[PDB]
Design a protein around this ligand. Structure first.
Ligand code: A1LXH
Ligand code: ZN
Length: 231
């Protein structure tokens, strides 16, 4: 069973195998007096790991490199951050100290820089317009347009039919919207449209927080987003 916020102390990381060669990683952090779970992804590429997103924090990110070593024993060589918030780029520095090459669209690198977060080293050319898609290691990086943020990328894994939303995709259990400071809620439902078109074979969808399910999360996410905006 997938882990939830109550089962994981701040500073510890769990790994959940979605598929052969494919894992989420789940951490917890204390943010605005509250305690939140958080997802990211790990994809096997040869004798090598691609890491999608930090574990939200330097401490949590060292911990995730350690659980990866213990449970998988392959080296993390690159990381992609799927937008500029601290739950996606915080720990980037631990990853770079460790030899990981860190990536992000240049939207992200800039926004990260303004907010004063940690900045991935390398730019992902090729995504600066909706529906754009590019291959990066064994996944496709797809840019759906503004949603959660102006820069959110989602990640698809064709080998396994695994779609990863980042925070642009809400878990099914979610009733209400999250951080909307940097969102554009009018397009968000159409960006989820583009996703739906590109990736209709997706057998697994992994929200940026909470439990994975199928492509129902997509409509469910748009449901949630519309409620918020009609209130
Ligand atoms: C679950 C969440 C909130 C949690 O997830 B998240 O990716 O928006 C996120 C981003 C950054 C977070 O740290 C900050 C948030 C706002 C801020 O501005 C002052 C400064 C730091 C916390 C979260 C969600 O679904 O949006
Ligand atoms: Zn988030």
């Amino acid at each position: 069973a997938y882990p939830t916020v109550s089962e994981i102390p701040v500073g510890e990381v769990r790994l959940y195998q979605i598929a052969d060669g494919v894992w989420s990683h789940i951490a917890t952090q204390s943010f605005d007096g509250a305690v939140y779970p958080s997802n990211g992804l790990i994809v096997r590429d040869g004798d090598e790991l691609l890491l999608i997103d930090t574990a939200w924090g330097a401490k949590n990110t060292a911990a995730l490199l350690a659980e990866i070593e213990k449970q998988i024993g392959l080296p993390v060589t690159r990381a992609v951050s799927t937008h500029f918030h601290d739950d996606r780029v915080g720990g980037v520095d631990v990853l770079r100290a460790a030899g990981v090459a860190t990536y992000a669209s240049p939207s992200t690198r800039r926004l990260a820089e303004v907010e004063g977060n940690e900045i991935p080293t390398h730019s992902l050319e090729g995504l600066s317009s909706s529906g754009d898609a590019v291959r990066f290691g064994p996944v496709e990086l797809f840019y759906p347009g503004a949603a959660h943020s102006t820069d959110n990328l989602v990640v698809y894994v064709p080998s396994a039919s695994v779609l990863y939303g980042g925070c642009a995709i809400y878990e099914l259990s979610r009733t209400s919207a999250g951080n909307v400071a940097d969102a554009d809620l009018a397009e968000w439902p159409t960006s989820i449209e583009r996703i739906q078109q590109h990736y209709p074979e997706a057998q697994f969808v992994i929200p940026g927080h909470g439990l994975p399910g199928g492509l129902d999360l997509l409509k469910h996410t748009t449901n949630v987003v519309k409620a918020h905006t009609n209130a």
